[PDB]
């Protein structure tokens, strides 16, 4: 609820951090992920460092992309993305350049045909 268009740009970015870490936290914790609490954090804090930059502004668009990045993380269908960025498969910088049709691709071999541990 708001009665105007006031707000500190910093805030928006700040919240984004926690919000993200929250997901990668409630997810990894359930994914028996033996990753350090910092792992998720770092990634999150970075997301903004890359977003706020690529956009260089905190306008609707900026949010559109953000809500579009974490949206594919919370989704029940996507159960690898959160693991991709965390594990390292995907970067917190490129994740933004990733198209809305790729985030679902959930492709493996695509990454690189150098290692095929056949983990499934």
UniProtKB/Swiss-Prot annotation:
It comes from the Eukaryota. Ubiquitous. Expression is significantly reduced or lost in glioblastomas, glioblastoma cell lines, anaplastic astrocytomas, and astrocytomas. The modification Phosphoserine is found at residue 99. The gene is PHF3. This is PHD finger protein 3. Residues 12-114 form the TFIIS central domain. There is a cross-link at residue 49 (Glycyl lysine isopeptide (Lys-Gly) (interchain with G-Cter in SUMO2)). It comes from Homo sapiens.
């Amino acid at each position: 609820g708001s009665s105007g268009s006031s707000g500190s740009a910093d805030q928006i970015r700040q919240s984004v951090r926690h919000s993200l870490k929250d997901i990668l936290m409630k997810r990894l914790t359930d994914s028996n992920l033996k990753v350090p609490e910092e792992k998720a954090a770092k990634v999150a804090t970075k997301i903004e460092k890359e977003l706020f930059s690529f956009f260089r502004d905190t306008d609707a668009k900026y949010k559109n992309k953000y809500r579009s990045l974490m949206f594919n993380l919370k989704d029940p269908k996507n159960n690898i993305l959160f693991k991709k960025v965390l594990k390292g498969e995907v970067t917190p910088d490129h994740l933004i350049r990733m198209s809305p049709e790729e985030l679902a691709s959930k492709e493996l071999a695509a990454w690189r045909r150098r290692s095929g541990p056949s983990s499934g």
